[PDB]
Design a protein around this ligand. Structure first.
Ligand SMILES: COC(=O)[C@H](CO)NC(=O)N[C@]1(C)CC[C@]2(C)CC[C@]3(C)C4=CC=C5C(=CC(=O)C(O)=C5C)[C@]4(C)CC[C@@]3(C)[C@@H]2C1
Ligand SMILES: COC(=O)[C@H](CO)NC(=O)N[C@]1(C)CC[C@]2(C)CC[C@]3(C)C4=CC=C5C(=CC(=O)C(O)=C5C)[C@]4(C)CC[C@@]3(C)[C@@H]2C1
Lengths: 172, 172
Protein backbone atom coordinates (compact mmCIF):
# COMPACT_ATOMS: atom_id res chain seq x y z
CA UNK A 1 0.00 0.00 0.00
CA UNK A 2 0.80 3.70 0.37
CA UNK A 3 0.75 4.02 4.18
CA UNK A 4 4.26 5.07 5.25
CA UNK A 5 5.30 6.38 8.66
CA UNK A 6 6.29 10.04 8.40
CA UNK A 7 4.40 10.60 5.12
CA UNK A 8 0.86 11.92 4.57
CA UNK A 9 -1.69 9.23 5.29
CA UNK A 10 -3.54 8.25 2.08
CA UNK A 11 -6.65 10.33 1.63
CA UNK A 12 -10.01 8.73 0.99
CA UNK A 13 -13.52 9.86 0.22
CA UNK A 14 -16.21 7.37 1.14
CA UNK A 15 -19.77 7.02 2.33
CA UNK A 16 -20.03 6.55 6.09
CA UNK A 17 -22.94 5.94 8.43
CA UNK A 18 -22.69 8.83 10.87
CA UNK A 19 -23.57 8.86 14.59
CA UNK A 20 -27.01 10.32 13.78
CA UNK A 21 -27.80 7.24 11.67
CA UNK A 22 -27.63 9.09 8.34
CA UNK A 23 -25.23 8.56 5.45
CA UNK A 24 -22.58 11.16 4.64
CA UNK A 25 -19.63 11.22 2.27
CA UNK A 26 -16.53 12.03 4.33
CA UNK A 27 -12.81 12.39 3.65
CA UNK A 28 -9.77 11.91 5.86
CA UNK A 29 -8.81 15.49 4.96
CA UNK A 30 -12.04 16.70 6.62
CA UNK A 31 -10.23 16.08 9.92
CA UNK A 32 -7.05 18.07 9.35
CA UNK A 33 -6.23 19.88 12.58
CA UNK A 34 -7.20 16.87 14.71
CA UNK A 35 -5.50 13.59 15.38
CA UNK A 36 -7.30 10.65 13.74
CA UNK A 37 -7.52 7.00 14.69
CA UNK A 38 -8.57 5.20 11.49
CA UNK A 39 -9.34 1.51 12.01
CA UNK A 40 -10.48 -1.26 9.66
CA UNK A 41 -12.58 -4.25 10.65
CA UNK A 42 -13.32 -7.22 8.37
CA UNK A 43 -17.11 -7.52 8.13
CA UNK A 44 -20.41 -6.56 9.71
CA UNK A 45 -22.43 -9.03 11.81
CA UNK A 46 -19.27 -10.69 13.18
CA UNK A 47 -18.21 -11.55 16.73
CA UNK A 48 -14.75 -10.01 17.40
CA UNK A 49 -15.38 -6.70 15.63
CA UNK A 50 -18.42 -5.60 17.73
CA UNK A 51 -16.34 -5.67 20.93
CA UNK A 52 -13.88 -3.24 19.32
CA UNK A 53 -16.44 -1.00 17.59
CA UNK A 54 -18.58 -0.67 20.71
CA UNK A 55 -15.51 0.04 22.87
CA UNK A 56 -14.30 2.82 20.57
CA UNK A 57 -17.83 4.21 20.38
CA UNK A 58 -18.49 3.94 24.14
CA UNK A 59 -15.19 5.67 24.92
CA UNK A 60 -15.36 8.31 22.20
CA UNK A 61 -15.27 11.08 24.82
CA UNK A 62 -11.79 10.00 25.89
CA UNK A 63 -10.62 10.54 22.33
CA UNK A 64 -12.49 13.86 22.16
CA UNK A 65 -10.53 15.01 25.22
CA UNK A 66 -7.39 14.34 23.15
CA UNK A 67 -8.79 16.28 20.14
CA UNK A 68 -8.81 12.96 18.29
CA UNK A 69 -11.43 11.71 15.82
CA UNK A 70 -12.06 7.95 15.63
CA UNK A 71 -13.21 6.49 12.29
CA UNK A 72 -14.02 2.83 11.61
CA UNK A 73 -14.09 1.20 8.18
CA UNK A 74 -15.00 -2.08 6.48
CA UNK A 75 -15.59 -3.29 2.92
CA UNK A 76 -19.24 -3.99 3.73
CA UNK A 77 -21.79 -1.52 2.38
CA UNK A 78 -22.92 1.49 4.37
CA UNK A 79 -26.41 -0.05 4.31
CA UNK A 80 -25.00 -3.14 6.03
CA UNK A 81 -23.30 -0.92 8.62
CA UNK A 82 -26.59 0.81 9.45
CA UNK A 83 -28.42 -2.52 9.60
CA UNK A 84 -25.97 -3.62 12.31
CA UNK A 85 -26.26 -0.28 14.14
CA UNK A 86 -30.06 -0.69 14.09
CA UNK A 87 -29.92 -4.27 15.36
CA UNK A 88 -30.79 -4.24 19.09
CA UNK A 89 -27.74 -4.70 21.29
CA UNK A 90 -29.46 -7.51 23.17
CA UNK A 91 -29.63 -9.43 19.87
CA UNK A 92 -25.97 -8.88 18.94
CA UNK A 93 -26.21 -5.46 17.30
CA UNK A 94 -23.94 -2.45 17.67
CA UNK A 95 -26.59 -0.02 18.88
CA UNK A 96 -26.24 3.75 18.49
CA UNK A 97 -22.72 4.85 17.57
CA UNK A 98 -20.61 7.83 18.58
CA UNK A 99 -18.15 7.31 15.68
CA UNK A 100 -18.65 7.16 11.91
CA UNK A 101 -18.30 3.84 10.07
CA UNK A 102 -16.87 4.10 6.53
CA UNK A 103 -17.81 1.73 3.70
CA UNK A 104 -15.00 0.55 1.36
CA UNK A 105 -16.88 -1.57 -1.21
CA UNK A 106 -14.27 -1.09 -3.94
CA UNK A 107 -11.52 -2.26 -1.51
CA UNK A 108 -9.35 0.67 -2.64
CA UNK A 109 -9.03 2.22 0.83
CA UNK A 110 -7.88 -1.07 2.35
CA UNK A 111 -5.43 -1.45 -0.54
CA UNK A 112 -4.12 2.09 -0.04
CA UNK A 113 -3.48 1.31 3.62
CA UNK A 114 -1.81 -2.03 2.87
CA UNK A 115 -4.33 -4.10 4.83
CA UNK A 116 -6.39 -5.91 2.18
CA UNK A 117 -6.39 -9.68 2.65
CA UNK A 118 -6.13 -10.23 -1.08
CA UNK A 119 -7.31 -13.83 -1.25
CA UNK A 120 -10.49 -12.88 0.70
CA UNK A 121 -11.38 -9.32 -0.30
CA UNK A 122 -11.71 -8.02 3.27
CA UNK A 123 -9.43 -5.92 5.44
CA UNK A 124 -7.21 -7.23 8.17
CA UNK A 125 -7.57 -5.42 11.52
CA UNK A 126 -5.51 -2.39 10.56
CA UNK A 127 -5.38 0.63 12.83
CA UNK A 128 -3.63 3.87 11.92
CA UNK A 129 -2.79 6.93 14.03
CA UNK A 130 -2.64 10.10 11.94
CA UNK A 131 -1.55 13.41 13.43
CA UNK A 132 -3.19 16.84 13.07
CA UNK A 133 -1.04 17.62 10.02
CA UNK A 134 -2.20 14.45 8.25
CA UNK A 135 1.08 12.56 8.78
CA UNK A 136 0.97 8.84 9.58
CA UNK A 137 2.52 8.13 13.00
CA UNK A 138 1.61 4.54 13.84
CA UNK A 139 0.67 1.31 12.05
CA UNK A 140 -1.07 -1.62 13.75
CA UNK A 141 -2.24 -4.69 11.81
CA UNK A 142 -3.75 -7.79 13.43
CA UNK A 143 -4.73 -11.04 11.75
CA UNK A 144 -8.51 -11.55 11.59
CA UNK A 145 -9.16 -13.37 14.92
CA UNK A 146 -7.43 -11.01 17.41
CA UNK A 147 -8.87 -7.68 18.52
CA UNK A 148 -7.37 -4.34 19.49
CA UNK A 149 -7.25 -2.39 22.75
CA UNK A 150 -8.73 1.06 23.26
CA UNK A 151 -6.40 1.53 26.26
CA UNK A 152 -3.36 0.94 24.06
CA UNK A 153 -4.70 3.22 21.32
CA UNK A 154 -5.22 6.04 23.84
CA UNK A 155 -1.73 5.47 25.24
CA UNK A 156 -0.30 5.88 21.74
CA UNK A 157 -2.34 8.94 20.75
CA UNK A 158 -1.46 10.75 23.97
CA UNK A 159 2.23 9.84 23.73
CA UNK A 160 2.45 11.12 20.16
CA UNK A 161 0.85 14.40 21.24
CA UNK A 162 3.21 14.79 24.20
CA UNK A 163 6.28 14.16 22.08
CA UNK A 164 4.91 16.54 19.41
CA UNK A 165 4.98 19.40 21.90
CA UNK A 166 8.24 18.72 23.73
CA UNK A 167 10.54 21.31 22.13
CA UNK A 168 7.68 23.85 22.01
CA UNK A 169 7.19 24.29 25.76
CA UNK A 170 7.95 27.38 27.86
CA UNK A 171 11.62 27.23 28.92
CA UNK A 172 10.92 28.34 32.49
CA UNK B 1 7.55 -1.87 1.01
CA UNK B 2 8.97 -5.00 2.61
CA UNK B 3 8.01 -8.67 2.49
CA UNK B 4 6.27 -8.90 5.88
CA UNK B 5 2.67 -9.91 5.14
CA UNK B 6 0.08 -11.16 7.64
CA UNK B 7 -0.68 -14.83 7.07
CA UNK B 8 2.52 -15.50 5.12
CA UNK B 9 5.84 -16.84 6.42
CA UNK B 10 7.70 -14.10 8.24
CA UNK B 11 10.89 -13.20 6.34
CA UNK B 12 13.74 -15.36 7.52
CA UNK B 13 17.08 -13.89 8.49
CA UNK B 14 20.48 -15.15 9.57
CA UNK B 15 22.47 -12.68 11.62
CA UNK B 16 24.97 -12.23 14.42
CA UNK B 17 23.33 -11.71 17.81
CA UNK B 18 24.64 -11.01 21.29
CA UNK B 19 23.08 -13.84 23.28
CA UNK B 20 21.92 -13.68 26.92
CA UNK B 21 25.18 -15.34 28.00
CA UNK B 22 27.06 -12.30 26.63
CA UNK B 23 28.54 -14.11 23.63
CA UNK B 24 28.16 -13.77 19.88
CA UNK B 25 26.18 -16.38 17.97
CA UNK B 26 24.77 -16.48 14.44
CA UNK B 27 21.04 -17.16 14.72
CA UNK B 28 18.11 -17.51 12.30
CA UNK B 29 14.41 -16.84 12.76
CA UNK B 30 13.82 -20.42 11.61
CA UNK B 31 15.81 -21.60 14.65
CA UNK B 32 12.66 -20.82 16.66
CA UNK B 33 10.11 -22.85 14.69
CA UNK B 34 7.88 -24.50 17.27
CA UNK B 35 7.74 -21.36 19.45
CA UNK B 36 5.99 -18.04 19.08
CA UNK B 37 8.41 -15.17 18.44
CA UNK B 38 8.22 -11.48 19.27
CA UNK B 39 10.74 -9.83 16.92
CA UNK B 40 11.27 -6.12 17.49
CA UNK B 41 13.48 -3.40 16.00
CA UNK B 42 14.81 -0.25 17.63
CA UNK B 43 16.58 2.61 15.83
CA UNK B 44 20.13 2.46 17.23
CA UNK B 45 22.19 1.65 20.31
CA UNK B 46 23.17 4.01 23.15
CA UNK B 47 19.94 6.00 22.89
CA UNK B 48 17.31 7.07 25.38
CA UNK B 49 13.89 5.59 24.62
CA UNK B 50 15.23 2.30 23.21
CA UNK B 51 17.00 1.08 26.38
CA UNK B 52 13.79 1.42 28.40
CA UNK B 53 12.01 -0.86 25.92
CA UNK B 54 14.85 -3.36 25.65
CA UNK B 55 15.29 -3.61 29.42
CA UNK B 56 11.53 -4.01 29.91
CA UNK B 57 11.35 -6.95 27.50
CA UNK B 58 14.50 -8.43 29.03
CA UNK B 59 13.29 -7.99 32.63
CA UNK B 60 9.97 -9.66 31.76
CA UNK B 61 11.35 -12.45 29.56
CA UNK B 62 9.98 -15.10 31.93
CA UNK B 63 6.42 -13.98 31.18
CA UNK B 64 7.12 -14.76 27.53
CA UNK B 65 8.86 -18.03 28.41
CA UNK B 66 5.66 -19.08 30.21
CA UNK B 67 3.90 -18.61 26.84
CA UNK B 68 6.55 -20.62 24.93
CA UNK B 69 7.48 -17.33 23.24
CA UNK B 70 10.98 -16.18 22.27
CA UNK B 71 11.69 -12.43 22.29
CA UNK B 72 14.37 -11.09 19.92
CA UNK B 73 15.49 -7.46 19.56
CA UNK B 74 17.35 -5.98 16.58
CA UNK B 75 18.95 -2.84 15.20
CA UNK B 76 21.31 -1.90 12.39
CA UNK B 77 24.24 -1.37 14.81
CA UNK B 78 27.24 -3.68 14.72
CA UNK B 79 27.40 -6.72 16.96
CA UNK B 80 30.30 -5.06 18.82
CA UNK B 81 28.09 -2.04 19.55
CA UNK B 82 25.43 -4.34 21.01
CA UNK B 83 27.99 -6.07 23.23
CA UNK B 84 29.44 -2.77 24.46
CA UNK B 85 25.94 -1.60 25.39
CA UNK B 86 25.27 -4.85 27.29
CA UNK B 87 28.67 -4.58 28.99
CA UNK B 88 27.84 -1.05 30.20
CA UNK B 89 25.93 -1.28 33.51
CA UNK B 90 22.35 -0.07 33.60
CA UNK B 91 23.21 2.38 36.37
CA UNK B 92 25.70 4.07 34.00
CA UNK B 93 23.35 4.31 31.01
CA UNK B 94 23.86 0.86 29.50
CA UNK B 95 21.65 -2.18 29.13
CA UNK B 96 23.35 -4.46 31.63
CA UNK B 97 22.89 -8.23 31.39
CA UNK B 98 20.14 -9.32 29.00
CA UNK B 99 17.69 -12.21 29.00
CA UNK B 100 16.97 -11.82 25.26
CA UNK B 101 19.25 -11.94 22.19
CA UNK B 102 19.99 -8.72 20.30
CA UNK B 103 20.42 -9.13 16.53
CA UNK B 104 22.77 -6.94 14.46
CA UNK B 105 21.50 -5.88 10.99
CA UNK B 106 24.45 -3.87 9.62
CA UNK B 107 23.50 -4.38 5.96
CA UNK B 108 19.95 -3.13 6.71
CA UNK B 109 18.48 -6.07 4.80
CA UNK B 110 16.44 -7.41 7.71
CA UNK B 111 14.91 -3.99 8.38
CA UNK B 112 14.19 -3.71 4.65
CA UNK B 113 12.56 -7.16 4.55
CA UNK B 114 10.29 -6.17 7.44
CA UNK B 115 9.43 -2.81 5.87
CA UNK B 116 10.72 -0.70 8.76
CA UNK B 117 13.82 0.98 7.33
CA UNK B 118 13.54 4.77 7.58
CA UNK B 119 14.67 6.19 4.24
CA UNK B 120 17.96 8.12 4.07
CA UNK B 121 18.48 7.91 7.84
CA UNK B 122 19.83 4.35 7.85
CA UNK B 123 17.88 3.31 10.95
CA UNK B 124 14.76 1.30 11.63
CA UNK B 125 11.44 2.54 12.95
CA UNK B 126 10.07 0.93 16.13
CA UNK B 127 8.74 -2.19 14.42
CA UNK B 128 7.44 -5.18 16.36
CA UNK B 129 6.26 -8.44 14.80
CA UNK B 130 4.45 -11.43 16.27
CA UNK B 131 5.26 -14.71 14.52
CA UNK B 132 3.54 -17.96 15.41
CA UNK B 133 5.08 -21.40 15.99
CA UNK B 134 4.66 -22.26 12.29
CA UNK B 135 6.68 -19.20 11.25
CA UNK B 136 3.61 -17.29 10.02
CA UNK B 137 3.39 -13.54 10.62
CA UNK B 138 0.35 -12.73 12.77
CA UNK B 139 0.78 -9.11 13.87
CA UNK B 140 2.53 -5.93 12.67
CA UNK B 141 3.27 -2.94 14.92
CA UNK B 142 5.26 0.09 13.71
CA UNK B 143 5.75 3.26 15.78
CA UNK B 144 7.37 6.47 14.67
CA UNK B 145 10.62 7.06 16.58
CA UNK B 146 9.45 9.17 19.58
CA UNK B 147 6.95 6.69 21.08
CA UNK B 148 7.81 3.38 22.70
CA UNK B 149 6.03 0.06 22.96
CA UNK B 150 4.24 -1.72 25.80
CA UNK B 151 5.23 -5.14 27.12
CA UNK B 152 1.71 -5.52 28.55
CA UNK B 153 0.16 -4.98 25.12
CA UNK B 154 2.64 -7.39 23.52
CA UNK B 155 1.76 -10.09 26.06
CA UNK B 156 -1.96 -9.44 25.50
CA UNK B 157 -1.45 -10.06 21.78
CA UNK B 158 0.68 -13.20 22.18
CA UNK B 159 -1.88 -14.63 24.61
CA UNK B 160 -4.75 -13.76 22.27
CA UNK B 161 -3.12 -15.43 19.27
CA UNK B 162 -2.39 -18.56 21.28
CA UNK B 163 -6.00 -18.56 22.52
CA UNK B 164 -7.49 -18.36 19.04
CA UNK B 165 -5.02 -20.95 17.69
CA UNK B 166 -6.87 -23.43 19.91
CA UNK B 167 -10.11 -23.38 17.88
CA UNK B 168 -10.86 -24.28 14.30
CA UNK B 169 -7.54 -24.81 12.53
CA UNK B 170 -7.17 -26.68 9.29
CA UNK B 171 -5.33 -29.72 10.74
CA UNK B 172 -7.46 -31.20 13.63
C1 LIG C 1 4.53 41.52 22.14
O1 LIG C 1 4.26 40.20 21.70
C2 LIG C 1 4.25 39.24 22.75
O2 LIG C 1 3.99 39.56 23.86
C3 LIG C 1 4.60 37.77 22.45
C4 LIG C 1 3.43 36.87 22.74
O3 LIG C 1 2.39 37.19 21.86
N1 LIG C 1 5.68 37.43 23.39
C5 LIG C 1 7.04 37.16 22.87
O4 LIG C 1 7.27 37.21 21.71
N2 LIG C 1 8.08 36.84 23.88
C6 LIG C 1 9.51 36.55 23.58
C7 LIG C 1 10.17 37.85 23.14
C8 LIG C 1 9.67 35.53 22.47
C9 LIG C 1 9.44 34.07 22.95
C10 LIG C 1 10.37 33.70 24.14
C11 LIG C 1 11.83 33.89 23.67
C12 LIG C 1 10.18 32.22 24.48
C13 LIG C 1 9.17 31.89 25.56
C14 LIG C 1 9.34 32.76 26.80
C15 LIG C 1 10.82 32.61 27.29
C16 LIG C 1 8.35 32.31 27.89
C17 LIG C 1 7.62 31.01 27.80
C18 LIG C 1 6.68 30.60 28.80
C19 LIG C 1 6.08 31.58 29.66
C20 LIG C 1 6.76 32.94 29.84
C21 LIG C 1 6.17 33.98 30.74
C22 LIG C 1 4.88 33.70 31.46
O5 LIG C 1 4.30 34.65 32.30
C23 LIG C 1 4.18 32.34 31.29
O6 LIG C 1 2.97 32.14 31.99
C24 LIG C 1 4.73 31.31 30.43
C25 LIG C 1 4.01 29.96 30.29
C26 LIG C 1 8.12 33.30 29.10
C27 LIG C 1 9.21 33.14 30.19
C28 LIG C 1 8.05 34.70 28.65
C29 LIG C 1 9.12 35.07 27.60
C30 LIG C 1 9.05 34.21 26.37
C31 LIG C 1 7.62 34.30 25.81
C32 LIG C 1 10.18 34.62 25.35
C33 LIG C 1 10.15 36.12 24.95
C1 LIG D 1 -3.41 -34.47 3.93
O1 LIG D 1 -2.49 -35.52 3.66
C2 LIG D 1 -2.79 -36.76 4.26
O2 LIG D 1 -3.76 -36.85 4.96
C3 LIG D 1 -1.87 -37.96 4.00
C4 LIG D 1 -2.62 -39.01 3.24
O3 LIG D 1 -3.03 -38.42 2.03
N1 LIG D 1 -1.59 -38.39 5.36
C5 LIG D 1 -0.30 -38.08 6.02
O4 LIG D 1 0.60 -37.56 5.44
N2 LIG D 1 -0.26 -38.51 7.43
C6 LIG D 1 0.90 -38.35 8.34
C7 LIG D 1 2.04 -39.25 7.87
C8 LIG D 1 0.42 -38.78 9.70
C9 LIG D 1 -0.61 -37.75 10.26
C10 LIG D 1 0.07 -36.39 10.55
C11 LIG D 1 1.25 -36.66 11.51
C12 LIG D 1 -0.92 -35.45 11.25
C13 LIG D 1 -1.73 -34.53 10.36
C14 LIG D 1 -0.86 -33.75 9.39
C15 LIG D 1 0.20 -33.01 10.26
C16 LIG D 1 -1.68 -32.73 8.55
C17 LIG D 1 -3.04 -32.23 8.95
C18 LIG D 1 -3.74 -31.25 8.17
C19 LIG D 1 -3.38 -31.04 6.80
C20 LIG D 1 -2.01 -31.48 6.30
C21 LIG D 1 -1.60 -31.27 4.89
C22 LIG D 1 -2.54 -30.63 3.91
O5 LIG D 1 -2.14 -30.44 2.59
C23 LIG D 1 -3.94 -30.17 4.38
O6 LIG D 1 -4.80 -29.56 3.43
C24 LIG D 1 -4.36 -30.36 5.76
C25 LIG D 1 -5.76 -29.90 6.22
C26 LIG D 1 -0.94 -32.14 7.28
C27 LIG D 1 0.02 -30.98 7.62
C28 LIG D 1 -0.22 -33.16 6.53
C29 LIG D 1 0.60 -34.11 7.43
C30 LIG D 1 -0.24 -34.81 8.46
C31 LIG D 1 -1.38 -35.53 7.73
C32 LIG D 1 0.67 -35.78 9.29
C33 LIG D 1 1.36 -36.84 8.36
Amino acid sequence: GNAKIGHPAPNFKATAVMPDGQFKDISLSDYKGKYVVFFFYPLDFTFVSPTEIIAFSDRAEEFKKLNCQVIGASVDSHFSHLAWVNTPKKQGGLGPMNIPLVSDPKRTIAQDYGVLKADEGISFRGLFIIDDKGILRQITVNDLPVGRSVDETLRLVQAFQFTDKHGEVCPA
